[PDB]
Amino acid sequence: KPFSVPNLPLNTLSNSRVPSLINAMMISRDHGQMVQFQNGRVTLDGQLQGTTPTSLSQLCKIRGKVFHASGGNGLNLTELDGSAYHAFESPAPIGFPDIGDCDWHMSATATNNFTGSSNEYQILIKQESAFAPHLGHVQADNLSAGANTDLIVSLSWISPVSDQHRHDVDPWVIPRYGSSLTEAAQLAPPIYPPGFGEAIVFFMSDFPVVSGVNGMRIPCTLPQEYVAHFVNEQAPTRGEAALLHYVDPDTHRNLGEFKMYPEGFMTCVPNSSGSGPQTLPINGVFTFVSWVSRFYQLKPVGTA
């Protein structure tokens, strides 16, 4: 079964870490040397990793039953379909947000007998001591729902931590899933740019971020729709890296070459300390050319 990537223009596809259209590609020497995102993680032969869902309907979602306690209210987590969360299969429930070290402003709705405005709750989930999604619970501020209420929660926007230990949001980092009690079990492994002059390609989307280190932008390593494609195809990985062309869909012109590694991420070689894929159009399609060795030398992409 031959390997392929979707024949879909980039700017029609979603970020795999927030539900937002891709509007740019970038490399980052500052942030792109090690990356351990937990969403948008899947092998080229279609093995899902981390908390990564097949569908965007699960992404940046939390489901749980409300608990009321002295130190504050919170949620006892389930999977989004309502089935039980287990602490062996993953760092958190599938689709749980993976943007660390920031406040999450979220919208929750009652899943049973939804009456209207009073069954929608604008809540704040902080990443402090009682943030323990791996153990099956998070503390939630400004949550007025009664005990044992079943809620589906959606990420609305993010902002600097409430406890003031930093004043910006760095979306390149992931949460501490097990709190200070333990490291999470099935974390999608760290990624490093392998290869000579290679930089990891990050697909960017706009999102409401207050004081972001790259402003209102969230990076990921695959479009969401690629994840569903690889999980569908399960094409055997027949080489060390997949050579791709980024191609204009009308003119058929090759706009640059890229390597996709089995771990499920892409790299390019920037032109002489340049911005690499950022100057390319965003309405192109990636296309599989051939399996190549990890040492295969890419032609530089972008301006100097």
120 vs 240, beta carbon nearer a copy of itself: 120
51 vs 179, beta carbon nearer a copy of itself: 51
Q: Which of residues 238-257 bind a copy of itself (CB under 8 A)?
A: none
Q: How far is the CB of 164 from a copy of itself (least distance, A)?
A: 14
**Which one of 173, 213, 216, 255 is in contact with a copy of itself (CB under 8 A)?**
216
25 touching a copy of itself, by CB under 8 A: no
**Which one of 65, 105, 126, 176 is in contact with a copy of itself (CB under 8 A)?**
105
Site string (162-191) toward a copy of itself, x via CB under 8 A:
------------------------------
**Which one of 30, 70, 84, 117 is in contact with a copy of itself (CB under 8 A)?**
117
Q: How far is the CB of 16 from a copy of itself (least distance, A)?
A: 10
Q: How far is the CB of 19 from a copy of itself (least distance, A)?
A: 5
Total site size for a copy of itself, rule CB under 8 A: 48
Which listed range, 53-61, 67-75, 128-136, 269-277, lies at the site for a copy of itself (CB under 8 A)? 53-61
In angstroms, rounded to a whole number, what is the distance separating the alpha carbons of residues 168 and 173? Answer: 12
Q: Render the burial of 33-54: b for 16+ CB within 10 Å, e for the rest.
A: eebbbbbbbbbbbbebbbbbbb
Q: Which of residues 143-162 bind a copy of itself (CB under 8 A)?
A: 156-157, 159
**Which one of 45, 141, 170, 206 is in contact with a copy of itself (CB under 8 A)?**
206
User: Which letter does DSSP use for residue 189 in this model?
Assistant: P
210 touching a copy of itself, by CB under 8 A: yes
Phi (first) and psi of residue 132, to 5 degrees = -140, 55
In angstroms, rounded to a whole number, what is the distance separating the alpha carbons of residues 264 and 48? Answer: 10
Phi (first) and psi of residue 288, to 5 degrees = -75, 130
Q: How far is the CB of 263 from a copy of itself (least distance, A)?
A: 21
Q: How far is the CB of 2 from a copy of itself (least distance, A)?
A: 12
Place of tokens 């060795």: 293
Contacts for 163 with CB less than 8 Å, ≥ 6 apart = 126, 128
In angstroms, rounded to a whole number, what is the distance separating the alpha carbons of residues 132 and 258? Answer: 38
In angstroms, rounded to a whole number, what is the distance separating the alpha carbons of residues 174 and 227? Answer: 19
Which listed range, 64-72, 181-189, 192-200, 222-230, lies at the site for a copy of itself (CB under 8 A)? 222-230
* Exposure on the CB side of residue 38, measured as CA atoms within 13 A: 25
Looking at residue 267, its amino acid is: T
Contact assessment for residue 64 and residue 78, using Cβ atoms and an 8 Å cutoff: yes
**Which one of 50, 53, 171, 302 is in contact with a copy of itself (CB under 8 A)?**
53
**Which one of 161, 228, 247, 292 is in contact with a copy of itself (CB under 8 A)?**
228
**Which one of 6, 178, 193, 256 is in contact with a copy of itself (CB under 8 A)?**
6
Contact assessment for residue 163 and residue 128, using Cβ atoms and an 8 Å cutoff: yes
Cβ neighbourhood burial of 266 (10 Å; 0-12, 13-18, 19+): buried
Structure-token pair, residue 71: 């130190």
In angstroms, rounded to a whole number, what is the distance separating the alpha carbons of residues 189 and 208? Answer: 28
In angstroms, rounded to a whole number, what is the distance separating the alpha carbons of residues 75 and 63? Answer: 8
Which parts of this chain interact with a copy of itself (CB under 8 A)? Answer: 6-8, 11-15, 19-21, 23, 53-58, 80-81, 105, 107, 109-111, 114-117, 119-120, 156-157, 159, 205-206, 208-210, 216, 224-225, 228-229, 231-234
